[PDB]
Amino acid sequence: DIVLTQSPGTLSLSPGERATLSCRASRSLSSVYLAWYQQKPGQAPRLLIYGASSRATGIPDRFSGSGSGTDFTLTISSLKPEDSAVYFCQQYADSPLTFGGGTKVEI
Amino acid sequence: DIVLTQSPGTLSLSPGERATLSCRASRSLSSVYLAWYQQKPGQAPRLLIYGASSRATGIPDRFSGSGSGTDFTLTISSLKPEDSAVYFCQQYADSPLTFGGGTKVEIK
Amino acid sequence: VIPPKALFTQQGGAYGRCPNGTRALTVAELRGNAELQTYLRQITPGWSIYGLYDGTYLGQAYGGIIKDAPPGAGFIYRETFCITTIYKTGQPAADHYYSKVTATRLLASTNSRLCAVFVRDGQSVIGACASPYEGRYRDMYDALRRLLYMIYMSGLAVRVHVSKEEQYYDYEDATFQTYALTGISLCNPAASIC
Amino acid sequence: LPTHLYKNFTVQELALKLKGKNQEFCLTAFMSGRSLVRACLSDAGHEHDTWFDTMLGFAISAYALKSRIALTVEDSPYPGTPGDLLELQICPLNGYCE
Amino acid sequence: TDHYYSNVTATRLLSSTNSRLCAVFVRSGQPVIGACTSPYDGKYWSMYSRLRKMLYLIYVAGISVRVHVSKEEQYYDYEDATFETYALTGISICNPGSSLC
Amino acid sequence: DPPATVYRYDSRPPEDVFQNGFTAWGNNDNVLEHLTGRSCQVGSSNSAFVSTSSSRRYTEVYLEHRMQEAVEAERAGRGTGHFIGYIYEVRADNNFYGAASSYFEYVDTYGDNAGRILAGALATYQSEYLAHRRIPPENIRRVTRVYHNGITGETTTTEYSNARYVSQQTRANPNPYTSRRSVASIVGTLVRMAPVVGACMARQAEAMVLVYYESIAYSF
Amino acid sequence: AQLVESGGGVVQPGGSLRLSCAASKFTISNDALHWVRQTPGKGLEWVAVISHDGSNKYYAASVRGRFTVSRDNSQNTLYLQMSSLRAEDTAVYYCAREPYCRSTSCYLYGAAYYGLDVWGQGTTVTV
Amino acid sequence: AQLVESGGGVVQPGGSLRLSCAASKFTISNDALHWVRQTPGKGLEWVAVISHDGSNKYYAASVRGRFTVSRDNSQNTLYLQMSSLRAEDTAVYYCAREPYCRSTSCYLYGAAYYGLDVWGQGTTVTV
Amino acid sequence: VPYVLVKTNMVVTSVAMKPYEVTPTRMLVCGIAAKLGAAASSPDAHVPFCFGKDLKRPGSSPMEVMLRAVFMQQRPLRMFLGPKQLTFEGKPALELIRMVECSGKQDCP
Amino acid sequence: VPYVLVKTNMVVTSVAMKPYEVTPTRMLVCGIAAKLGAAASSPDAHVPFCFGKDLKRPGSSPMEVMLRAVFMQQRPLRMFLGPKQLTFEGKPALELIRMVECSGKQDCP
């Protein structure tokens, strides 16, 4: 029963700027129970950063996590044109696997 | 264990007077659970009044009851010589069906 | 709740002693069941007086009337209207739960269910009935009577689990539904129960 | 079978033992002035029955509530030996038996 | 072979699935003896139902009692224990300096 | 939502309460000790709180059952069958602290194991409010007399009006009380039976039989 | 409505006696019955009661476990069985019929109490 | 790692459905599987989880009783049995494979979390 | 005549259990109930009740758990006494067939 | 992988019972254990546990008896929970196979 709210509603940034995506949790979850997904329009989501201080397989280094607490952020270094998708933050520190609202980043 | 007491004891009354008997209890009894009996010398008693308000089928209309509570009285009014006997009062408001001492009426 | 007419006992109890598993019918419930009142018309004979929990239902010769009375006034007559307290609703079994409740108003017949009324903020919510003699959760009665007793001694908020496959009408003039109990969970706000 | 009826008595001792194959629980009743009352119901052919288990919870409840109890007991043939307990009654709480 | 330990209080309860429920009996803080009951296995197996009631009461109220054990059964349920543990023959609540117990 | 009126059962006549009021027995103001009963038991009654309640129904039920003790004791030949009971009304100023609220704070900041479940489970069922130091006579407004006579079996209820009462706009302090950690070896919550009533509520009214609540909370 | 009150009394302090009530004309299966004793010293005292089907039986304090009551509807008779009689059992034993209370005691149900009205001549039992 | 998500969803509210997951390269006998629905309005929501041997199977609050999960590791398939579907069941159902937890939940044990990383094309279910 | 009596506003003031003389395989759980606030003159000031308990089936019966619960809480009940009679301390007692708690004034006048 | 966990200084703050899905012969007894000193939002303050009680055997299992005792007294206990998982309010709970009360800060870090 933990609700994740992404306060960035929708971003349109330059193809070289830095984007920060905040994920606010209802309770203070630990850092090792977080993940970030990317849903380009027309396919199922793919993991970007699980355990925010750690990356997944087959992903560029431009994606970075943040620290623990109640607020967490995803950092993208250089927004290449291929990075126009909807980004989620999930949780697993409690039994229901709750996903975030979905922050849409379009270029 | 309700003890019924008939205080008058032995009564000596003329064949024309009115007979009054008193039966009192240590605790209040409902009016429906008290009766009176007549024990002529030598035989078994037969009930005169039950519930202090009505008579048995064969009882003549000369005996009446009284009010409820801890005081109960029976009145004979006209007193033929046939009615010389010993009268008891019985309660059935609890488990022990307790009778009373009995009052002996004598006719001179 | 108005019990359906299917629970009417074919051979009613005598002198208020309804058979085990049945209960006396109140005049309010008879007044609310139009089918039951119509059904009684063809079974009650003339000048025959039958007793209910509150009052009496006299014969069809008088016109088939219901007369209210204090409890025990209708028990003296011979036939007493009694209804079975078990009914098969047909709804599939599911884990229905009610949170922030407290056990109140216990009830239990001889070979029948131990039951309680779970109340939140004053108003009744649901009743849960458990028996070790009949039902589908019979084997689990002994484990629940100990937790029910603990939450009745002290008014601790619990979450009551009920199964709707069996509906129970043990209570009289009940404005709430009573079902079969399927577990009690003391609620901790930090654990996300209440 | 001389049986005595005791009223207005409070449990002080509640001892569960092992005497032979069967078992027993001996409880003691105390009044302000009267002598000590000792009694204990034991398994006597009640192996399949649950008669011992039912009353054992009552005497423990009587000790927890620290309330007056009214026991009926048949005195032992030998002095100093507790009698057999047959019926146990708990008087109204914070009150006395009639 | 019945041995008792008077003036004991019940603390440090142990319980494991499908096995014995135990209790450590302490005198003036320092433990003196431990006991166990079990309805599945054990010499005094039939006594659990009659003795879980007394075992619960003595623990919740913290009253001084007497414990009856038999060294015919030795249990090692307590890890790194400095005290022995046996089976529970019975629990007795008796006055100090009393004749019954 | 703190209550504006609190109640208290007592047996003292109104002509004596209205001139002196109540008074805490001792200076020990440990919150858990009071709600458990260690500070209202015989020989250790030193609680700094006088016990009240926010539910008049709970105070009537205690009266409604203290009446039956007179009836029961009359049959046993230990009484006369009569009963004179009193239910007071006190307006809560900024010295009345809740019991359920204060117990939770004591547990939530001094460790979960520092307090018993039934100690705070009883305050909720009691709706009890603790009054520190004393309840002044100005805080008492009306007392409800109850007369029961065993001969007739009729109860007469009369309500008197205080003369020293000073009407103000006050309420119970919503902030829970802060007390030092309990140093005594608390064994269990002491409760008076028939019905279950806390040790401090029951004992301050007027030897009592006080039973640990846990010993009876589970049926043997 | 007549009763014969069979049974005669002479018994040593340990013996047992079986007294019999017998209904002459009226049927007895639908009414309760009582035994009442009359000692010239202490007055009339209540002995025992019995219901119509035998479901309910109650005795007095002095004969609570000693005496016993039985009823046989085949012969329309009522019996009383005695355990060992001490010296206090010397009295005359009577038979009573509480008319309409099939159950033993009508005081619980709140029903009206109708009193006896049929006693037998009595039998003298002494030790 | 390919999943086909066979079956299609068009069923009247009182009916039943049975979806299928079929892996392609990774063997299904040693990985936990999740179902996640994507409501266009309410976003992504979790449906159910299943363990590798089938011991632990946890569902969501809304689909606690109506939905059912099952596996057949011999044929490398994962099934979801669907009971009476209301209007809120309309979503796109996916197949998710949690990498390093052969049991349903890893947060209980304090183990580190690896999030899914395998998803199917998805099947559309409407009522 | 024997008939079932329904009582109101009664609290259980005493509880007991005794061996049933009629049958060795059953067991009687008796008690005393009193009307709340009634005087001695009323017949409801002291009513005895008894209900049978089977000694072969373990566990507390549904009747006993309430009679345990409503005893130390001193709650009012609505007892369906009768129509059968049991023995309690020699004095007759009315058998208990159904017990319901008191919701308020509406059902417990 | 599932592995057996050992937790120190846990106090039971809730008790629950519920039927067992796989077989009606058994029924689960659950609870919630909170670690002393843990943060309010830390997962160690909301650890759920359950164990199975056989219904063919009337009475009480040994685990229930002491669990009821520690819950009332709010005593610490070292809990050997693991590795199986049992449903509890639809949420996973570690099955409890052995649980022992604490003896002090020396043996319960």
Coordinates of N, CA and C in Angstrom, one line a residue, chain E residues 16-49:
Chain E
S16 N 9.0 -24.8 19.7 CA 9.4 -25.1 18.3 C 8.3 -26.0 17.7
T17 N 8.2 -25.9 16.3 CA 7.1 -26.6 15.6 C 7.2 -28.1 15.8
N18 N 6.1 -28.7 16.1 CA 6.0 -30.1 16.3 C 6.9 -30.7 17.3
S19 N 7.2 -29.9 18.4 CA 8.1 -30.3 19.4 C 7.7 -29.7 20.7
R20 N 8.5 -29.7 21.7 CA 8.2 -29.3 23.1 C 8.1 -27.8 23.3
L21 N 7.1 -27.4 24.1 CA 7.1 -26.1 24.7 C 7.8 -26.2 26.1
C22 N 8.7 -25.3 26.3 CA 9.6 -25.4 27.5 C 9.5 -24.1 28.3
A23 N 10.2 -24.1 29.4 CA 10.3 -22.9 30.3 C 11.5 -23.1 31.2
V24 N 12.2 -22.0 31.4 CA 13.3 -21.9 32.3 C 12.9 -21.4 33.6
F25 N 13.2 -22.1 34.7 CA 12.7 -21.7 36.1 C 13.9 -21.1 36.8
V26 N 13.8 -19.9 37.2 CA 14.8 -19.1 37.8 C 14.5 -18.9 39.3
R27 N 15.6 -18.9 40.1 CA 15.5 -18.5 41.5 C 16.5 -17.4 41.8
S28 N 16.0 -16.3 42.3 CA 16.8 -15.1 42.6 C 17.6 -14.7 41.3
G29 N 16.9 -14.8 40.2 CA 17.6 -14.4 38.9 C 18.3 -15.6 38.2
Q30 N 19.2 -16.2 38.9 CA 20.0 -17.3 38.3 C 19.1 -18.5 38.1
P31 N 19.2 -19.1 36.9 CA 18.4 -20.2 36.5 C 18.8 -21.4 37.4
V32 N 17.8 -22.3 37.7 CA 18.0 -23.5 38.5 C 17.7 -24.7 37.7
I33 N 16.6 -24.7 36.9 CA 16.2 -25.9 36.2 C 15.3 -25.5 35.1
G34 N 15.2 -26.4 34.0 CA 14.2 -26.2 33.0 C 13.4 -27.4 32.8
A35 N 12.2 -27.2 32.2 CA 11.2 -28.3 32.0 C 10.6 -28.1 30.6
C36 N 10.1 -29.2 30.1 CA 9.4 -29.2 28.8 C 8.2 -30.1 28.8
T37 N 7.2 -29.8 28.0 CA 6.0 -30.6 27.8 C 5.8 -30.7 26.3
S38 N 5.3 -31.9 25.8 CA 5.0 -32.0 24.4 C 3.8 -33.0 24.2
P39 N 2.8 -32.6 23.4 CA 1.7 -33.5 23.2 C 1.9 -34.5 22.1
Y40 N 3.0 -34.5 21.4 CA 3.2 -35.4 20.3 C 4.1 -36.5 20.7
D41 N 5.3 -36.2 21.4 CA 6.2 -37.2 21.9 C 6.6 -36.9 23.3
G42 N 7.1 -37.9 24.0 CA 7.5 -37.8 25.4 C 6.8 -38.7 26.3
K43 N 7.4 -39.0 27.5 CA 6.8 -39.9 28.4 C 5.5 -39.4 29.0
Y44 N 5.5 -38.1 29.3 CA 4.3 -37.5 29.9 C 3.6 -36.7 28.8
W45 N 3.2 -37.4 27.7 CA 2.6 -36.8 26.6 C 1.2 -36.4 26.8
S46 N 0.5 -37.2 27.5 CA -0.9 -36.9 27.8 C -1.1 -35.8 28.8
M47 N -0.1 -35.3 29.4 CA -0.2 -34.2 30.4 C -0.1 -32.8 29.9
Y48 N 0.2 -32.6 28.6 CA 0.4 -31.3 28.0 C -0.9 -30.5 28.1
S49 N -2.1 -31.1 27.7 CA -3.3 -30.4 27.7 C -3.7 -30.0 29.2

